[PDB]
Enzyme design. Structure first.
Site, PDB file in Angstrom:
ATOM      1  N   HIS A  12      52.800  90.082  14.682  1.00  0.00           N
ATOM      2  CA  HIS A  12      51.309  90.494  14.092  1.00  0.00           C
ATOM      3  C   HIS A  12      50.989  91.931  15.092  1.00  0.00           C
ATOM      4  CE1 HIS A  12      51.929  86.925  11.881  1.00  0.00           C
ATOM      5  NE2 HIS A  12      52.251  86.292  13.246  1.00  0.00           N
ATOM      6  N   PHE A 120      48.888  83.726  13.801  1.00  0.00           N
ATOM      7  CA  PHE A 120      48.035  83.668  13.058  1.00  0.00           C
ATOM      8  C   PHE A 120      47.380  82.755  12.068  1.00  0.00           C
ATOM      9  CE2 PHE A 120      45.145  87.887  12.563  1.00  0.00           C
ATOM     10  CZ  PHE A 120      45.385  87.449  10.793  1.00  0.00           C
ATOM     11  N   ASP A 121      46.314  82.436  11.747  1.00  0.00           N
ATOM     12  CA  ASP A 121      45.813  81.864  11.112  1.00  0.00           C
ATOM     13  C   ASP A 121      45.206  81.893   9.658  1.00  0.00           C
ATOM     14  OD1 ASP A 121      45.280  78.849  10.931  1.00  0.00           O
ATOM     15  OD2 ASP A 121      43.628  79.198  10.448  1.00  0.00           O
TER      16      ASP A 121
END
Length: 124
Positions: A12, A120-121
């Site tokens: 990410h 990372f949600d």
């Protein structure tokens, strides 16, 4: 093996660019980070900010994760993100992504000591 912390940077973080500058960002970035090694990762988000600023999210707004977990954090600030979604033309190993640039609040899962971003949600 690679840490969940290191995995997150790989998958990410993109501090080298302030935004995606072309429609090929995703194709180029999903490949070179190895996210398409075994299969097309269907979706992935790149954050175009300092490592340090993303790590700080771990001491921001605590929120429940989309799965109910309680170790999620939401960025006070909006952040430059790149959304990557697989395309109808996507065919392993020729994975194809639609590139979408946005400024949004990022929600991450934090773990460890140092307490840092591991997942990372969502982007809100």
């Amino acid at each position: 093996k690679e840490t969940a912390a290191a995995k997150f940077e790989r998958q990410h973080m993109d501090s080298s660019t302030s935004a995606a500058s072309s429609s090929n960002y995703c194709n180029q970035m999903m490949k070179s980070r190895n996210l398409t090694k075994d299969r097309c990762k269907p979706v992935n988000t790149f954050v175009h900010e300092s490592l340090a600023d993303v790590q700080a999210v771990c001491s921001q707004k605590n929120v429940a994760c989309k799965n109910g977990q309680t170790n999620c954090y939401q960025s006070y600030s909006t952040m430059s993100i790149t959304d990557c979604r697989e395309t109808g033309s996507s065919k392993y190993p020729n994975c194809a992504y639609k590139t979408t640039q946005a400024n949004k609040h990022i929600i991450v899962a934090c773990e460890g000591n140092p307490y840092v971003p591991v997942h990372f949600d969502a982007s809100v």
